[PDB]
Structure formats: structure tokens, C-alpha cells
Design a binder for this molecule. Structure first.
Ligand code: MG
Ligand code: MG
Ligand code: MG
Ligand code: MG
Ligand code: MG
Ligand code: MG
Ligand code: MG
Ligand code: MG
Ligand code: MG
Ligand code: MG
Ligand code: MG
Ligand code: MG
Ligand code: MG
Ligand code: MG
Ligand code: MG
Ligand code: MG
Ligand code: MG
Ligand code: MG
Ligand code: MG
Ligand code: MG
Ligand code: MG
Ligand code: MG
Ligand code: MG
Ligand code: MG
Ligand code: MG
Ligand code: MG
Ligand code: MG
Ligand code: MG
Lengths: 149, 77
RNA sequence: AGCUUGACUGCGAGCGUGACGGCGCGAGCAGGUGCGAAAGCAGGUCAUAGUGAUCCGGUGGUUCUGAAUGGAAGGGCCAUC
RNA sequence: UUGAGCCUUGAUGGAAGUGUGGACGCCAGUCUGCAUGGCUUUAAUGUUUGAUGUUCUAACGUUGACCCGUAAUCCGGGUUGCGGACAGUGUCUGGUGGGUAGUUUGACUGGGGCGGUC
RNA sequence: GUUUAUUAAAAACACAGCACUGUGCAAACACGAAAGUGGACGUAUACGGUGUGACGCCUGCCCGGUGCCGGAAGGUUAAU
RNA sequence: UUUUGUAUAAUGGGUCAGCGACUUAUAUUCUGUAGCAAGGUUAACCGAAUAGGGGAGCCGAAGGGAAACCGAGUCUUAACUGGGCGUUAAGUUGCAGGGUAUAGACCCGAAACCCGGUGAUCUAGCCAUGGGCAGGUUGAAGGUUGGGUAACACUAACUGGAGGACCGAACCGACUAAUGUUGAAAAAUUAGCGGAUGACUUGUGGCUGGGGGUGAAAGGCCAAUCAAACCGGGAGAUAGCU
RNA sequence: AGGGUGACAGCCCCGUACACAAAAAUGCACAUGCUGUGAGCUCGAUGAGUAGGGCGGGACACGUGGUAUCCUGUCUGAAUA
RNA sequence: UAAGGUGAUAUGAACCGUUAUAACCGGCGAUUUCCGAAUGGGGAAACCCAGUGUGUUUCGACACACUAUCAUUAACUGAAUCCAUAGGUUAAUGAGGCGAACCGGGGGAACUGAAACAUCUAAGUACCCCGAGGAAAAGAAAUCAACCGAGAUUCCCCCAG
């Protein structure tokens, strides 16, 4: 009695691992109570296929927009800026929708503050390249041009 | 009728044989048990009269296949 | 008393005695041996009791056998329990 | 909890001073850690493997109660309570077993038995 | 009171009484491969087995043997 | 007939007639006989059917050795002066017969063992539902009233109607004697006898089945039988006996 | 061939050898119809609680034997031309 | 098919026939009480008693048909549970019982032989039980052989006591 798992399951469980259990635990509790299934070989591919059409399929289906920053590898047109201040230095901050203002017409339009650098955001020159939240892995690169008026 | 519903296993006859090699008519008879199986295919407990082994057979071929027989053979279940 | 292993191995003309199974005696032959200078004597004990058939099984030996073939198991044969 | 193996982080194979439990410590050491201050002899885990013990429920028992099939002291399905890997049963196995069964239990002999003998 | 209907009616069996012993109930026990059933629609003031045999006065010693009961050490010991 | 021996007072037979016991099959060997002869002969089957075909095969012409093997020799043993068994006599197939083997094996006969059935119309026990007990005695508890006690106790009449109680018919039994004993009767008749309101007696119907029942226990009863019923089967059990 | 008829019949009778026969119901053959039914080629697939094993038995002429082969009550359990 | 007939003991009677409906024989039909598998219920076989449909110049009642069980299927219903299962009724098909041997299977003795007896025998016999056919069963090699080869099963003669 080997059988494969469905749900977690205490001292062996794992959503689909390959266990080998006493016949009783199984034909008395695990199965006929939705938790496992005889490893009928028919199944050891039926629940191994997934392990391919998924853990090597949909884990690749993720890679279709590398870095998401594709043809934006040459910065973006600087429509306006992101502000300034302190007669020379910096003083003003980014409202909850004010890092777009510059890159405010490139990709798609949004308006949210998924803050990434929990600092007082350094006040100097202006043009910087950190990362920002583009996804749970990749990044992006652009700059920031001030406004002289 | 001590008869395993899955494998047909009924009791048999044989001797005893002492040290003296003395023949004595006996029976061997199946290790039957009757057990409540859950089907899900029918949301019910079909409770067969089964010999262990019969059990092992269900544990491999699958109840839905074992009841597939019987049904196909005429048996109640 | 000295020296010794003939309480030897293979055989055995020819007799005894038994319904039988069997048991007994036996010179002589071959090989090899002890004793004796030699002739010679020794195949246990002065003789006659001191015993258990067969089957099954054990041990040693021996290619005799060995179920397609080579081996092996088992079997035989000799010895012995 | 516990006998034994493997994996490991502490024992055998960013200085000096103002400070601490355990110890085969060659017989009087120094240690093993505890604070700080400009492949083989040792302890705990993750564990793998057997033993013991608690409990669990979900096989299994129910000759408690209820529901329905059903105007039914059977049976079946269902609910519930109690018990519960025990009990019981299959195979195997040691013991017991005139309860039952098949038999054996000699011959000679001044009849037979006893004695005696083979 | 019972008994050898048909050679034995008795001092034999039974008996009320006494004792021992088993049995917590799905009882022990008994019929039965089993299901089912008696025991009992009873529950230890009950049910079974065994012996003794109204009642009076009593019922001593022996546990070596046999039988039965109990025993969580060791020895020996089966399948595995 | 059986016996050392039977007129034997040891067995069997009243007599007649009819029936009544060494067979049959297959093997096997021997004698007789016939055929063929170092050979003889086919079986199943085919079939032109008692022919013919069919030579599968069997026996014989070679034995010795456990055997491999050798071979008119061979085995024993290292080898035999030798010794054992062989080489020097014809077979084989029918047919009749004499033995034997396997079958009931010359015939008749057990007491029994086993299987499957039929039996509680007799009888044992039990279950349900019905029935029966003339007549006569004894007079338990309890109750009433007197007497009595301080009150109970006690006590006397009466009342009451207990009992595996007494006597005795029916009914149930069965202790003694006689008769019977080719009976009136395969268990009785006659005169006596025990029980007779009880653990009584009886009708009808029911249940218990053979290693089983039932048993106030005798090994009693279970259809004129019981230390294991009857019927059919195994079955022609077996019979070193008559 | 046989039987009968007043005793023993080829020629007296019924038969016998031989040659014939069915309106109906059926048997079996064929030739056809009906319902079916599947045919041939190519490419595949190739019988798991099974084989095997422990234990207890039973079958094989074989009585556990040195014992192959087969069946399985019980416990287990492969390979995949 | 026919010139004779109405079976027998067994006459007699009353009849029927003789050229085709006397009788006799054969094919096919009709009728076929009751009991009996017995099947509407019951039951001490040949009897008792029903329910539902029918049916009458006298539509009381009394005669005729259907109503067992089980299995497969179908329709309609339909619980604890709301679905669904179970259950319930109806209908169509089928089965039942009997009977020689032979056959396959499930169980399976003893006497007796071994001059006793237990392994062994008798013997997978007798017998009980289930099932089936004109036959049954078996059957197209995970078979033999033996370095050549054979080619399912069944039966017979040998091999060989
Ligand atoms: Mg005895
Ligand atoms: Mg004597
Ligand atoms: Mg008396
Ligand atoms: Mg008497
Ligand atoms: Mg008397
Ligand atoms: Mg008592
Ligand atoms: Mg007494
Ligand atoms: Mg006394
Ligand atoms: Mg005393
Ligand atoms: Mg005499
Ligand atoms: Mg004379
Ligand atoms: Mg005389
Ligand atoms: Mg009666
Ligand atoms: Mg009286
Ligand atoms: Mg009286
Ligand atoms: Mg009288
Ligand atoms: Mg006596
Ligand atoms: Mg009698
Ligand atoms: Mg008899
Ligand atoms: Mg006889
Ligand atoms: Mg016989
Ligand atoms: Mg294949
Ligand atoms: Mg009827
Ligand atoms: Mg009826
Ligand atoms: Mg006997
Ligand atoms: Mg004998
Ligand atoms: Mg066939
Ligand atoms: Mg080839």
C-alpha cells in the first residue's frame, strides 16, 4: 500500500508526494475520506504528469516578459519631472501618485504607492535608478529629469 | 455460507496427519470478515462479506471494479 | 622370559551340520609380515556359550551409476555403525 | 518516555584584566562552557529504526435508546450512546483433552489361571 | 413417593434438609459446524454441577500421593 | 459324519419327488496333442470379414557382472594353482487338461462394522387443552365467648376445616399363593394385597431420533427385541470354525 | 426364413425373395429467401494479487523422500521478448 | 383400408354396415373432471374456503376467466434524508416438477487385506448432494523429445506387472 496524497496529511502529507503507508490507515481513513489514492501506476503518471505540466510548465509560462522592461532599455521621455526644492537642494516629496508624472505616458497608466525604499528618500542631484515594484522578481530602469520653471 | 464474495473462497477439506501420520477429515476455511467499504461512486457503505485477501484484492483492483463484478456476475451487494 | 602383531588381505581342494536362512572345519595357493640358526610355527585365546535376520538410516572409501549435456543430488559396490 | 544508528552544532584523534556550574580530573593540573572590556572514547536537537505507556477513532463489537422500510420482539439502512485496535474469528502452533474414536493387551501349560518358562 | 412393562418393590432411586463448588448476566451450563435456542422474560435470598440425605447429639487427626487452586524469580520449552 | 476308536447311550436324517455345491474370466507354468522350427506368433485395427492384411510387439536363439562393461565367456582378486555362474538338451503358437495368481473362487452359516433412510399409534420425559376420585374418619392454624392475669402468658367450651393424614369402592398399581405352562391368555385368571386430594389418575393433540433420545437410575424405555431400534444398502463383510 | 391349419405342407392360409406407396406431420441432408451475424488487409496490443515463495493439506503410479510437476486454506509476492 | 362390425372376462340385447363418413389402421386437430410441481388461500392428496373482473324477456345469485413463488427487463410509484438509494404495485418473458443408464462436479465410509494392528488397503468404492448433454468431459502446447525431431483432446493395442 503505497498510494499518493491529496491534502497535506500529518507525518507524511504533501499535496501529492509519494508515500508508503500501512494498508489500514489507507483503506479505513485516508482514501474513502478524500486524502489519498492507491498508487495504481496509472496514477503515478496521472499525478506525475502534473509534476511536469506545471512545475516545469507554468513555472516557465511565467517567463514571457523578461524583466518586464523589454524595449524600455533606453530610459523614457521626460514629460515633466518629480519636483525639487530648497533653492538648490531638495524639499518636496512624492505624493501617493507622483513618480509617474515623468514616466507618465509610457507603458500603462496606474496610480498606486507600492513603496520600496523605506527611507527619507535621498535629496540630491535627481536622476536615480533603484528598481520599484514591477513584480515579485524582476525590475526596471529609467531616470528623472527636473523642471526649470 | 462461509464464502468470500470477492474471490469465491469457500471452505475446503483435508486431513490431519498425526506424528503417527493418522488421517482425520477436517476443513480449512477462509479468513472471512465482512467489512464496511466506502464507495463515493455511490455515496454509501456497501458492506461486503470478505476474506482478507479479498480485501487485498479490492485494495489493488479497486472497489468500483470489484463491485463492477458481482453486479456483472449477478450477485447482490 | 625375549622379540613381536598371523587377532594379516585376497582365496580355498575337500568335508561336517542344517527344511531353509545359515553355522563349522580345512590343507593348499598369491601378496605381505613376526618369531626361529634351521626344520618350521602363526588367518587369535584347550575346545565347545558370550547373541539379533531384513528394512530404514549414518560414516569412510570407490566416477560403477547419474532421466537433454557437463556436473551434482540420489543409487550401487567395499568397509563399518 | 525509551535501547540503538545517521545530520549536525559545543569535547578526545578579533587581547589581557574586574566575574560563574559540571569534572575520568597522573596526587593536588587544568579545564568545558557560562559574563564581560579600550572513520573513534563525549551533551542536546532534527531525525531513521524497535520496545513500553498514555490517549485518539476510523476497522471491529454492542443481547442501550431512537428513526424509517413496516401496524413487524426477525432482518436491513440511518442517528445516537457505550466500547474500541481490545474483543472475536481464519491459518499456524505448544499444552490440556476416556468427552469421543480406532485398536492392543503373546505363547507354552497334564483344563484355565497363579507360579514358572521362552 | 420411584423402580427392573415380562423371574428382583428392596435395605436400591427420589425426597425435604446440609455442605462443597461454579456463575456479574451476551451468566455459568446445555442443544447446536452456525444462525438460533433453553437457563429466564430469572439476576447471587438467583441459576448450574457434585456429594450427603428428616430430626436429635455430633462430625477428630493426615496435604506424602492423586486431584483441584494460587505464584510477575529462575531452569526447560512451539510455530515464528 | 467325526474320530486313536462308534451297534454305540456321540452328529444328521419322519418318508417321497423336485432343486442343491470345485465354476467363470484373465494371466501363468507344466503334461498331452497339433502346426511350424532357429524360429514361432501376431494385438489393436483394416477387411475382400472364421480368408486375407496388419509383425506394433512378445517369447526363443548368450551369458557373466551390482554396474560401466566384457562376451562363449564373464565375475571375483593385484593375480589366481583357482573358485562362482555360464558355453555341451529347441523353440514358439494354438487346443484339451493338471496346479497357481487376481476375482465371492466348492456351497450354506455368524455375532458384527459403515452409509442413507423409517419409527414417540407401545413405552420414558415434557408441552397445551379437557376429564375423574362412592362412602366413612381424624379435627391443624385462625376466630368468638367465658374463666384468667396489673397486662400479656395461660386455660375451657365452641366455632373453623388443615393434611404427599386415616379406613374404603371407582380408578392407578402389582406384594403372596394356587391355576395355567402344545394356556382362555407370546405375562393372564382366581383369592388375598398397595395407593386412592396427590410427587394422583386419565382422553385428545403436540415435541425429543439411534452413539441419539428419554430415564425419582433398572443399562430401564424408545411398536411382543435394546450394553446401542427398525428398513434398505455396502453385501456373496469376514469365518485358519462346523 | 418362419408361423398356422384335425399328425411333419416350397405349391391350403399369413408370409418370405423381389418390386411398390403418403393427404397429412415430422428427421436429415443439401439448393435458396428472412432476421441476423461477422468476413479480408494494414498498424497495434499479448491475460498481477498472477508466477514464485513460508506454513498446513491435497493431487500426480511416487506414503517428504534427495522430490521435480500440479491444486490452494493461510501469509506474502516478481519480471514484462 | 375394407365386407364386415359396437376392446376383454362374456354371452345376450339393441343396433351399424356391405363401393364408400360401418368398423379397423396411421397423420393433424377438438375435448381432456379432480388430486398431483399444483402455482388464488388452505389442507389429513383427489377436499375446504376466497378476492377481483365479467355474464341472465326470472341480471337475487349461481356459472366462466384471472390472481403462487422466484429471476431478468420495463413502466408507474416511493422512506429514514431533500437529491438519491432502499422499499411498493403492475406488466412481458422465463424457471419450477418428473425420469433408465451413461457424464461433470461438491462431500465421502466401513467391513475387509496386511493372516493381530495404527502408516498402508479396501477406495475416491458404496452412498448423499448439485448440474448438464445426446453424449458429457477434454482440447490447439509456457506439451514432449534430446542436439534428430514431434506437434491439440478423446479412445484402442503395446511398452510392462
Ligand atoms: Mg475407548
Ligand atoms: Mg494359551
Ligand atoms: Mg411405600
Ligand atoms: Mg419385574
Ligand atoms: Mg415383583
Ligand atoms: Mg442448587
Ligand atoms: Mg446415600
Ligand atoms: Mg445413612
Ligand atoms: Mg471429616
Ligand atoms: Mg472322542
Ligand atoms: Mg464295532
Ligand atoms: Mg445314534
Ligand atoms: Mg401421546
Ligand atoms: Mg392420604
Ligand atoms: Mg385406602
Ligand atoms: Mg386380583
Ligand atoms: Mg448392574
Ligand atoms: Mg420392546
Ligand atoms: Mg441392519
Ligand atoms: Mg455370508
Ligand atoms: Mg465389500
Ligand atoms: Mg500470452
Ligand atoms: Mg389450489
Ligand atoms: Mg398449496
Ligand atoms: Mg477394523
Ligand atoms: Mg486385518
Ligand atoms: Mg462440450
Ligand atoms: Mg527444433
Amino acid at each position: 500500500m503505497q498510494v499518493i496524497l491529496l491534502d497535506k496529511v500529518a507525518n507524511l502529507g504533501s499535496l501529492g508526494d509519494q508515500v508508503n503507508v500501512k494498508a489500514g490507515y489507507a483503506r479505513n481513513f485516508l482514501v474513502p475520506q478524500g486524502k489519498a489514492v492507491p498508487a495504481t501506476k496509472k496514477n503515478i503518471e496521472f499525478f506525475e504528469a502534473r509534476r511536469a505540466e506545471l512545475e516545469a510548465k507554468l513555472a516557465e509560462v511565467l517567463a514571457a516578459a523578461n524583466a518586464r522592461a523589454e524595449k524600455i532599455n533606453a530610459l523614457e521621455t521626460v514629460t515633466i519631472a518629480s519636483k525639487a526644492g530648497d533653492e538648490g537642494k531638495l524639499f518636496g516629496s512624492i505624493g501617493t501618485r507622483d513618480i509617474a508624472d515623468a514616466v507618465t505616458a509610457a507603458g500603462v497608466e496606474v496610480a498606486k504607492s507600492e513603496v520600496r525604499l523605506p527611507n527619507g528618500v535621498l535629496r540630491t542631484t535627481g536622476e536615480h535608478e533603484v528598481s520599484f515594484q514591477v513584480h515579485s522578481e524582476v525590475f526596471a530602469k529609467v531616470i528623472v529629469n527636473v523642471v526649470a520653471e | 455460507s462461509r464464502v468470500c464474495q470477492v474471490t469465491g473462497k469457500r471452505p475446503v477439506t483435508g486431513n490431519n496427519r498425526s506424528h503417527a501420520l493418522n488421517a482425520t477429515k477436517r476443513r480449512f476455511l477462509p479468513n472471512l470478515h465482512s467489512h464496511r467499504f466506502w464507495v463515493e461512486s455511490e455515496k454509501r457503505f456497501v458492506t461486503l462479506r470478505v476474506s482478507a485477501k479479498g480485501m487485498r484484492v479490492i485494495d489493488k483492483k479497486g472497489i468500483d471494479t470489484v463491485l463492477a463484478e458481482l453486479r456483472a456476475r449477478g450477485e447482490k451487494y
